[PDB]
């Protein structure tokens with residue numbers, strides 16, 4: 001069930017909001033995981049919670065422009081959610 | 085008094101009402117106005133983003149400016165995150181398109197809590213951008229505001245040696261715009277009174293100042 005995934009995403013977003021700049025050593029793997037759960041969604045999982053916790057670990061760590069080139073498909077999949 | 089007549093159903097109305105409510109410490113109304121402006125802008129964003137990204141940048145800059153108001157809330161709420169958001173602001177401003185028209189409004193929504201005398205690393209770049217874009221009369225105003233005293237009124241008094249980056253940029257602007265002779269003597273005097281300064285600075289621990297002064301002298 002996706003309940004465990006939603007729960008761990010919500011708690012990890014709350015944790016990233018609690019501890020800022022002490023999670024920069026983890027944001028890369030979190031990005032690689034959460035973009036593969038957001039984009040190329042093989043299942044109909046909750047995308048709003050993933051989007052929220054993704055936006056929550058970039059306002060605390062300060063990952064502003066680097067992910068736009070480290071993951072060249074981030075802007076396109078962020079823009080598609082307005083038409084899908 | 086002016087915002088009371090702006091329509092409440094448009095994006096600019098919600099944006100300005102959020103800014104006004106934020107000015108008087110209303111952290112609950114401002115969030116609601118921000119969340120309303122979010123969708124009021126998302127409408128035209130998804131209407132315009134279907135063509136191209138370069139066409140939707142005009143709404144993306146506004147969405148970015150709107151998403152920087154929550155960081156103003158965090159600035160006025162938690163004193164421990166002030167320097168961190170003040171640094172991510174500078175890190176995020178380096179990604180936008182170098183145009184004075186949007187830089188002005190971004191810095192205005194940003195200076196709601198940060199005076200120009202508190203983060204001048206981002207205002208010197210703004211002055212240089214205004215100088216390169218042919219708008220030298222705005223670069224002069226920005227440099228004068230950063231300095232604190234307008235040297236164009238006292239043609240005989242020297243330039244304020246404090247804030248060395250600001251006076252260096254001011255001398256560059258004076259050389260570029262109008263006068264190629266006065267800026268030369270000004271730079272000579274500045275180099276003299278700046279080299280006569282590092283001698284009395286025997287720094288044993290703070291080594292983040294001597295190297296910067298040496299680079300500036302170079």
Ligand SMILES: O=P(O)(O)O[C@H]1[C@H](OP(=O)(O)O)[C@@H](OP(=O)(O)O)[C@H](OP(=O)(O)O)[C@@H](OP(=O)(O)O)[C@H]1OP(=O)(O)O
Nearest residue numbers: 208209210211212213215216252253256257260299300302
């Ligand atoms: O445009 P220039 O008159 O040639 O001056 C440049 C310019 O800085 P300014 O325009 O603010 O003076 C560079 O920055 P950009 O505008 O080109 O991005 C800056 O390099 P930085 O980006 O690292 O600040 C460089 O400094 P440097 O010579 O160390 O490369 C500096 O040259 P000068 O200060 O010597 O004029």
